Motif scaffolding. Structure first.
Motif, short mmCIF file in Angstrom:
data_model
loop_
_atom_site.label_atom_id
_atom_site.label_comp_id
_atom_site.label_asym_id
_atom_site.label_seq_id
_atom_site.Cartn_x
_atom_site.Cartn_y
_atom_site.Cartn_z
N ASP G 1 0.89 -1.21 -0.01
CA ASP G 1 -0.11 0.03 -0.11
C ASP G 1 0.96 1.18 -0.11
N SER G 3 2.60 3.13 2.14
CA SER G 3 3.20 2.91 3.50
C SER G 3 3.65 4.20 4.02
N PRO G 81 5.27 0.33 8.91
CA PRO G 81 4.58 -0.55 8.48
C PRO G 81 3.55 -1.47 9.16
N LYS G 82 2.61 -1.89 8.49
CA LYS G 82 1.46 -2.68 9.20
C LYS G 82 1.34 -4.24 8.56
N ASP G 85 1.05 -5.11 4.74
CA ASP G 85 1.42 -4.35 3.74
C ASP G 85 2.60 -4.83 2.56
#
Ligand SMILES: [Zn+2]
Ligand SMILES: [Zn+2]
Ligand SMILES: [Zn+2]
Lengths: 181, 602, 39, 82, 146, 40, 160, 49
Positions: G1, G3, G81-82, G85
């Motif tokens: 995404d 990020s 970051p998740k 991602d």
RNA sequence: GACCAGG
DNA sequence: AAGCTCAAGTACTTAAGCCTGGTCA
DNA sequence: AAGTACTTGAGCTT
């Protein structure tokens, strides 16, 4: 601070009103008039001092109206009464009438000097005073306790200031005789 | 202190309050269940009162929880559970009067609810600081009538808070008055104003053991027991009358009874070695007692469940209960159960709050018996060579006094005017005592240079580079080092004198003048000499408290210093008109009086 | 601790203004990444 | 709270027995930490007598904030004080 | 004559011992405090009564306001970064998926999440001792920081 | 411990007034050279 | 995404003594520190910073020490970051133990063989024994396809 | 060695402790004045009058 | 920590 | 009846700082 | 010893 004149450690020479007028040439340099008269207000509070000295009321003591920090015009009543009744009581040192004065003196000038020292001699804010009173009791509480009928000394002080007890040992009263009796 | 360390926080207040049942387990790091302290291999028993996780037992043992050496391990609490929970000993009396106020069958107050709600409005309006407004609300004269009176108090408070919205001293003066009136009201009543019953009375002991006889037959027409019963009845009391108690205190969880008390880390409870004896301490012992009584409770409760048989069961179980109550009372109040308890080591007034917090032993501060000297100054104070060579203070190193610190470290810590040992900016302190003059010269050469072996050597916070090397040097002729003699009655008893360093003798020297302030006879009485380390402290000292700047004792105005006995009668012999001096004596005497060069200025 | 948006072109412009703001290894790697992202 | 404006200041313009002390102290410490000497030294070594040599010339930084007991403050430079 | 530059300390509160045989320090307080605090020397007071005797750097949780609740993190990762202390009481258990950053572990092996408001305040060791004994009496003081 | 038990039950928070309290936690006292603050 | 996010944070910097002339350079001495290093508050690693300004409040001196303090407001671009991602990197090193990539030329990616399904096979060239093409089940050679895409695990995963 | 007169009955002596003092021979006058002297007891000592 | 000493 | 101020009577903490020695279980 | 405030019971009035 009970109008304070300072915290006692410097207020001593106020009552020595002869001392300043005696020399007066070194004290003015000590107070550093050229730098102090600049930033601080002088005329307004000195004007209101007379209005407060008006014997009728509705005028506060000048110290309440104008705090003694910046207005170079406020002093307690008794201080101004002292300087005035000294100028009128002992006019020997101060010259006078007025023209002969304006060589080396001036009554208003010297009065402004005393006004200035009072301003210069306030309690410097931030002084821890409570502990000062603590020392002021502790030291003499040590000083004398062997006497040279009510008890006098530390047993007495113990009741008035420490225990504040009801039914003290000898609570007495004194009544003045009158002419009819 | 160090000059580099920045700590940013500015504490604005602390808040006291009880501690509940969830957080005691949140802060728990282990459970203490086994009474035995040490085994045959003498190692710290696992889970025992000296468990390694609690606090690193010395002889260089790393703590289990944080895994770092003892020099930096801050210690961790431990919990010790109890399903008895006994009521907290310190609140026993207030808990007792609250129990007296309870109505067990009613579970409301012995007082009329309308009166307790008046009490509630009092505090509600006190919270925002309105004193006369609180005494106003009583201006009403009139269950149904009682409910109308409560609603009148409610509307009074409603308009009062509405007008108000659109701690400090006098608050407590009223909030204690309400407490005293609260007791005066609550404890006077016997029968329920709500229920009309006569809930049974209660009798206690100073040993913290409570109960009384059940109801009488006549009042029924109208001892010792478990703490869980008392706890549940108090729970009902609180939750049914949440308002006024919330104002008094909303939370009511464990105020009176403690479900898990904490053992503080081993760091705080050491096994001091005096000679050979190794006694654990009083607190470890008593915690051992309560732990053993707890396991005895567990076993005896199991014996009860497994089943005058009921009579023996309840008797022995109540005996175990009262024993654990008694020993926890002993722990928290050694005034009960006749070793120190915690309350007595605090309130003892020999111990904390008076002997460790207000006044504590201090470093960098020597002491000697004191002889007089008239020759130095009224400012200056003598300092013997031992105090000079041994009393150290830091000095940052700049561009313009590098020369002086160079000479200082060249001399070393054994010969005045040497410095003591060199601090590096990272935080270490390397000595000059075990080194040689060659090594000291080498170390002094690289005294003004960034030696941190990177731009940011410790971690990614790079101000460590800026601070200079602090050289710990001895006092010298200009430093200002305090004096005091106990008893210090009045403030000119402690002053700041400029140091002058003498050769040889083993006792400080002062001038006659200051004497009458410190109130010493110099017959052989001794005075504490201190040395403020940092520069802020010595600066404010040198300026505010320089001896001459304390010339007027502050009880009155009169001067407290002065010249004394020989000087004054020889003054009466010099001022006298019968004395005449020739040229030689006059020049000599004037010069001896002035002594220009050492004082200077001319 | 306040959080807002960062879009693609915003990343390029922010790195540009940063290399213009404070004036070695970090700047080297930032130039490498800027050359790889562009072109 | 408030940060009192320059137009109306109630505080006393005198360099008190205390502000002198703390000002000179923190200034001497500053200058001890390799700080800008804003006045030509006389060769003087002590990291504090330099501070007095500076304050005699009234060329010092470090305005002081006088806390009124209310909670507001007035911020006075050292040159501005008497 | 007894001089105390640096020397042995107290098992409990790390104040110098009561000696002249153990290089013990001299007592300064409970009237010496009144002397200075009359002199108006708050810095001298804070220096002698705090700085020279018992100085420390201790961490506190700003969220919960507790000083016992600080634990320094163990086994975060390899050498990496330094042990960044956290707060147990304001942290919740590790059940659930969360990002690798805020988590950390316990010496016994437990992981947690939360308790990051740990700052570094100076505090005299004796107050640490008072917190210990006080919470032993089951009551703990909650000090705020802003 | 009596003042402690009552101020602990009520949980009454000072800011912290006297210099004895300002001192027990090690911060500079209110009075004296500590009355004012100095800024750059 | 997407990020990358921008975060304008407030931090409390210590103005060291020798830099009492100007705080801006004193801001620099520590703003150059945090870059390319982890700040735990914002949950990201510092990338760069601009817009340095101090709120005019007459910065304060720590009340026993000579260096002062001040609030500074600065906008970081931390890579946040998740879980879930998606990240791309240019492959540099390859081996039959893991896959080695660089994202943005700066951040490392080392993805073990477990996160690779057994569908992808390693061919060993005769020139360099360690280095070799990590083909897919299809037959695509990944060395010319330097841009490789995968997901975040905490470390990567190519297994779907 | 110590002086704790520990007996079931005090034998009509008020204070139970302190009956013994070391004879510090520090200087002869102190030796004599140890042998001659008396002392009336700590019970009255503690009272302030 | 407690009992005698001592400034 | 019982409400409610009145009375002696029962529990209950402090008594200056320091500093230095010694003996002790 | 000193003295404090604390709390309970017995006698008088509505
Ligand atoms: Zn640990
Ligand atoms: Zn009822
Ligand atoms: Zn927390």
């Amino acid at each position: 601070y009970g109008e304070d004149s300072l915290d006692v450690t410097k207020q001593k020479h106020l009552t020595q009103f002869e001392f300043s007028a005696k020399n007066y040439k070194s004290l003015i340099q000590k107070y550093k008039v050229k730098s102090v008269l600049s930033a601080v207000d002088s005329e307004t509070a000195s004007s209101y001092a007379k209005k407060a000295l008006k014997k009728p009321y509705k005028y506060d003591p000048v110290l309440d109206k104008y705090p003694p920090s910046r207005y170079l015009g406020s002093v307690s009543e008794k201080f101004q009464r002292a300087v005035d009744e000294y100028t009128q009581k002992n006019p020997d040192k101060l010259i006078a009438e007025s023209k002969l004065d304006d060589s080396l003196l001036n009554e208003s000038k010297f009065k402004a000097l005393m006004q200035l020292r009072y301003q210069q001699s306030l309690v410097d804010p931030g002084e821890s005073v409570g502990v000062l009173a603590s020392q002021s009791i502790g030291e003499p509480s040590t000083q004398m306790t062997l006497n040279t009928n009510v008890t006098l000394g530390i047993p007495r002080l113990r009741e008035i200031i420490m225990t504040a007890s009801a039914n003290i040992q000898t609570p007495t009263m004194t009544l003045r005789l009158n002419d009819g009796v | 202190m160090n000059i580099a360390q920045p700590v940013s926080s500015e504490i604005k207040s602390v808040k006291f309050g009880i501690y509940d049942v969830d957080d005691v387990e949140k802060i728990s790091v282990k459970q203490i269940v086994n009474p035995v302290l040490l085994d045959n291999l003498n190692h710290p028993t696992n889970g025992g009162l000296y468990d390694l996780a609690l606090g690193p037992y010395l002889k260089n043992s790393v703590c289990a929880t944080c895994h770092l050496d003892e020099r930096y391990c801050p210690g961790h609490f431990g919990h010790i559970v109890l399903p008895i929970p006994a009521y907290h000993p310190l609140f026993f009396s207030q808990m007792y009067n609250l129990l007296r106020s309870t109505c067990l069958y009613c579970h409301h107050f012995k007082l009329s609810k309308v009166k307790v709600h008046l009490f509630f409005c009092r505090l509600k309006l006190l919270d925002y600081g309105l004193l006369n407004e609180s005494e106003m609300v009583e201006n009403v004269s009139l269950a149904k009538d009682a409910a109308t009176l409560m609603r009148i108090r409610d509307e009074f408070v409603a308009k009062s808070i509405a007008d108000s919205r659109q701690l400090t001293t006098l608050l407590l003066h009223e909030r204690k008055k309400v407490v005293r009136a609260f007791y005066h009201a609550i404890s006077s009543r016997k029968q329920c104003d709500n229920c009309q019953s006569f809930s049974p009375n209660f009798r206690k002991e100073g040993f913290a053991k409570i109960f009384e006889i059940p109801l009488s037959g006549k009042n029924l027409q109208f001892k010792y027991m478990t703490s869980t019963e008392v706890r549940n009845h108090l729970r009902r009391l609180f939750v049914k009358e949440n308002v006024v108690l919330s104002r008094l205190y909303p939370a009511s969880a464990d105020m009176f009874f403690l479900q898990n008390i904490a053992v503080p880390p081993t760091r705080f409870r050491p096994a001091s070695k005096m000679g050979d004896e190794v006694h654990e301490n009083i607190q470890n012992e008593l915690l051992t007692r309560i732990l053993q009584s707890s396991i005895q409770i567990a076993s005896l409760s199991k014996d009860s469940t497994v089943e005058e048989r009921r009579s023996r069961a309840f008797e022995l179980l109540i005996n175990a209960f009262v024993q654990l109550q008694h020993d926890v009372n002993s722990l928290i109040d050694s005034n009960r159960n006749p070793p120190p308890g915690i309350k007595q080591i605090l309130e003892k007034k020999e111990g904390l709050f008076r002997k460790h917090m207000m006044g504590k032993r201090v470093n960098y501060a020597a002491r000697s018996v004191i002889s007089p000297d008239p020759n130095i100054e009224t400012n200056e104070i003598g300092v013997p060579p031992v105090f000079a060579t041994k009393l150290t203070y830091p000095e940052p190193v700049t561009l313009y006094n590098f020369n002086e610190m160079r000479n200082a470290v060249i001399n070393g810590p054994h010969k005045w005017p040497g410095a003591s040992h060199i601090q590096n900016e990272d935080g270490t302190l390397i000595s000059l005592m075990p080194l040689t003059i060659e090594q000291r010269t080498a170390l002094a050469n690289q005294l003004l240079t960034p030696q941190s072996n990177l731009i940011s050597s410790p971690y990614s916070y790079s101000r460590l580079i800026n601070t200079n090397k602090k050289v710990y040097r001895h006092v010298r002729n200009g430093d200002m080092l305090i004096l005091n003699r106990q008893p210090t009655l009045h403030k000119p008893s402690m002053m700041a004198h400029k140091a002058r360093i003498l050769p040889g003798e083993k006792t400080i020297r002062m001038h006659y003048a200051n004497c009458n302030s410190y109130n010493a006879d110099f017959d052989g009485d001794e005075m504490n000499m201190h040395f403020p380390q940092s520069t802020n402290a010595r600066s404010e000292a040198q300026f505010i408290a320089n001896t001459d700047s304390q010339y007027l004792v502050p009880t009155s105005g009169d001067p407290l210093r002065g010249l004394i006995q020989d000087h004054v009668v020889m003054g009466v012999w010099l001022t006298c008109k019968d004395t005449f001096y020739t040229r030689d004596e006059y020049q000599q005497l004037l010069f001896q009086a002035l002594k220009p060069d050492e004082t200077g200025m001319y | 601790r306040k959080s807002e948006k960062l879009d693609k072109d915003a990343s390029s412009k922010f790195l540009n203004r940063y290399i213009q703001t404070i004036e070695e290894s970090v700047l080297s790697q930032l130039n490498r990444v800027l050359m790889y992202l562009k072109g | 709270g408030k940060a009192v404006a320059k137009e109306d200041r109630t505080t006393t313009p005198y360099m008190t027995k205390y502000e002198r002390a703390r000002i000179l102290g923190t200034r001497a410490l500053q200058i001890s930490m390799n700080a800008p000497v804003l006045v030509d030294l006389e060769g003087e070594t002590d990291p504090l007598q330099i501070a007095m040599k500076e304050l005699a010339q009234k060329k010092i930084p470090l305005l002081v904030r006088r806390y009124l007991p209310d909670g507001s403050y007035e911020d006075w430079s050292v040159a501005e004080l008497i | 004559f007894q001089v105390r530059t640096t020397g042995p300390i107290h098992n409990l509160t790390r104040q110098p011992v009561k000696g002249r045989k153990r290089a013990g320090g001299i007592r300064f307080g409970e009237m010496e405090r009144d002397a200075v605090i009359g002199h108006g020397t708050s810095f001298l007071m804070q220096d002698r009564l705090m700085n020279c005797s018992d100085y420390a750097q201790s961490w506190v949780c700003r969220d919960c306001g507790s000083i016992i609740s600080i634990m320094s993190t163990i086994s975060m990762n390899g050498v990496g970064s330094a042990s960044e202390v956290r707060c147990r009481s304001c942290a919740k258990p590790a059940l659930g998926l969360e990002d690798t950053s805020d988590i950390w572990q316990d010496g016994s092996g437990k992981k947690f999440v939360g308790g990051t408001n740990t700052t570094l305040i100076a505090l005299p060791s004796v107050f640490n001792y008072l917190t210990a004994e006080l919470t032993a009496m089951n009551i703990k003081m909650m000090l705020e920081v802003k | 411990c009596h003042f402690l038990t009552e101020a602990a039950l009520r949980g009454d928070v000072d800011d912290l007034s006297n210099p004895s309290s300002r001192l027990v936690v090690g911060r500079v006292g209110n009075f004296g050279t500590g009355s004012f603050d100095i800024f750059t | 995404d997407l990020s990358l996010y921008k975060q304008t944070v407030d931090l409390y910097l210590s103005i060291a003594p020798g830099h009492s002339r100007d705080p801006l350079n004193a801001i620099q001495e520590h703003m150059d520190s945090m870059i390319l290093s982890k700040l735990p508050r914002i949950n990201g690693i510092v990338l760069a910073y601009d817009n340095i300004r101090f709120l005019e409040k007459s910065a304060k001196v720590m009340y026993d020490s000579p260096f002062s303090f001040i609030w500074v407001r600065v906008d970081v671009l931390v890579f946040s970051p998740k879980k879930g991602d998606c990240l791309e990197g240019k492959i540099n090193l390859v081996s039959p133990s893991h896959i080695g990539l660089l994202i943005l030329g700066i951040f490392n990616a080392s993805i073990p063989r477990k996160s690779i399904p057994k569908d992808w096979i390693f061919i060993e060239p005769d020139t360099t024994e360690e280095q070799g093409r990590w083909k897919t089940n299809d037959g695509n050679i990944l060395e010319p396809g330097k841009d490789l895409e995968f997901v975040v695990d905490g470390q990567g995963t190519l297994a779907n | 060695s110590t002086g704790n007169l520990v007996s079931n009955t005090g034998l009509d002596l008020q204070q139970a402790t302190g009956y013994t003092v070391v004879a510090e021979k520090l200087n002869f006058y102190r030796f004599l004045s140890h042998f001659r002297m008396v002392h009336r007891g700590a019970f009255f000592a503690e009272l302030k009058t």
